[PDB]
Amino acid sequence: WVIP
Amino acid sequence: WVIP
Amino acid sequence: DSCIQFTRHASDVLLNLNRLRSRDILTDVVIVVSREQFRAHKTVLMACSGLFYSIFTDQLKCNLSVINLDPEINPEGFCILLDFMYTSRLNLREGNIMAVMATAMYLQMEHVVDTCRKFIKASE
Amino acid sequence: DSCIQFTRHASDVLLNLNRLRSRDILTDVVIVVSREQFRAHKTVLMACSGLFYSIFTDQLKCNLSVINLDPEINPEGFCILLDFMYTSRLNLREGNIMAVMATAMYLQMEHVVDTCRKFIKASE
Ligand SMILES: O=C1Cc2cc(Nc3nc(Cl)ncc3Br)ccc2N1
Ligand SMILES: O=C1Cc2cc(Nc3nc(Cl)ncc3Br)ccc2N1
Numbered sequence: 001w002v003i004p
Numbered sequence: 005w006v007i008p
Numbered sequence: 009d010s011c012i013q014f015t016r017h018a019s020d021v022l023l024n025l026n027r028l029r030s031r032d033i034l035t036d037v038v039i040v041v042s043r044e045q046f047r048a049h050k051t052v053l054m055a056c057s058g059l060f061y062s063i064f065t066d067q068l069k070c071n072l073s074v075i076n077l078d079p080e081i082n083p084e085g086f087c088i089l090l091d092f093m094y095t096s097r098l099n100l101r102e103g104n105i106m107a108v109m110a111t112a113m114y115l116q117m118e119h120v121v122d123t124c125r126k127f128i129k130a131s132e
Numbered sequence: 133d134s135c136i137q138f139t140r141h142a143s144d145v146l147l148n149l150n151r152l153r154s155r156d157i158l159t160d161v162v163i164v165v166s167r168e169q170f171r172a173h174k175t176v177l178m179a180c181s182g183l184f185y186s187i188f189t190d191q192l193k194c195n196l197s198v199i200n201l202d203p204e205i206n207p208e209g210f211c212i213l214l215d216f217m218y219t220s221r222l223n224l225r226e227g228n229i230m231a232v233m234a235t236a237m238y239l240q241m242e243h244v245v246d247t248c249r250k251f252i253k254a255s256e
């Protein structure tokens with residue numbers, strides 16, 4: 001999971 | 005396009 | 009093999025499937041979550057959820073145009089998860105995390121359950 | 133928004149749609165290319181091809197279970213492109229590049245047409  |  | 013690969017292809021496909029969803033094009037099922045209704049593509053639901061994969065591979069349920077979820081399921085949690093299916097983006101907030109995690113466990117969406125458990129563990 | 137994103141989600145969705153294709157699950161159209169037949173999901177075809185997007189948004193053709201391509205279309209070129217749609221991988225070879233490019237132009241698959249033109253330009 002990432003900060004888009 | 006890339007070499008997978 | 010000696011194939012070449014287009015990096016953005018999978019993302020572009022999903023973006024187009026979401027465009028079809030937004031315009032209600034070729035949607036083939038209604039998911040009923042209490043008083044709310046959500047139109048979707050059976051194939052996208054199966055590709056994202058162990059529960060929908062099991063439902064639409066059943067020889068009788070594969071032909072249903074309406075699926076009723078358990079009454080304990082929260083419509084907002086379902087909406088957040090349906091959006092995630094079609095976009096890869098999850099709108100996880102302090103106010104919705106419990107409902108989103110419970111819905112992802114029911115839908116059998118393992119990666120979502122995992123990030124919810126980690127975000128909850130960080131706040132305890 | 134304040135969304136989080138799961139990097140591999142789009143790829144995982146496409147991998148699952150290809151698994152459904154391989155097991156012939158919920159395929160809803162046959163594409164006829166001369167003597168050959170190819171089963172597929174209308175939504176995946178539309179998401180990958182400007183021609184299929186135009187075909188299945190037509191109020192009459194949206195309901196067809198069989199689509200016949202132009203007789204000039206090569207079944208092997210179509211097969212290579214159908215595999216690319218469901219996998220992001222393109223089996224581009226000296227022996228098939230002309231047929232693949234002609235098929236991608238007909239299907240309106242702009243990125244495939246682009247790499248074919250570049251690979252041809254390099255060999256001249
Ligand atoms: O957390 C998750 C997400 C998910 C998706 C599917 N979907 C499919 N799985 C397989 Cl193996 N083939 C085709 C399809 Br469609 C099955 C289980 C799960 N569990
Ligand atoms: O080279 C390409 C690939 C492609 C795909 C689509 N498909 C869609 N386009 C739009 Cl804007 N909305 C929903 C869908 Br499905 C249209 C044109 C093209 N040209």
Ligand SMILES: [Cl-]
Pocket residue numbers: 056117118119120121
């Ligand atoms: Cl997931």
Ligand SMILES: [Cl-]
Pocket residue numbers: 180241242243244245
């Ligand atoms: Cl393309």
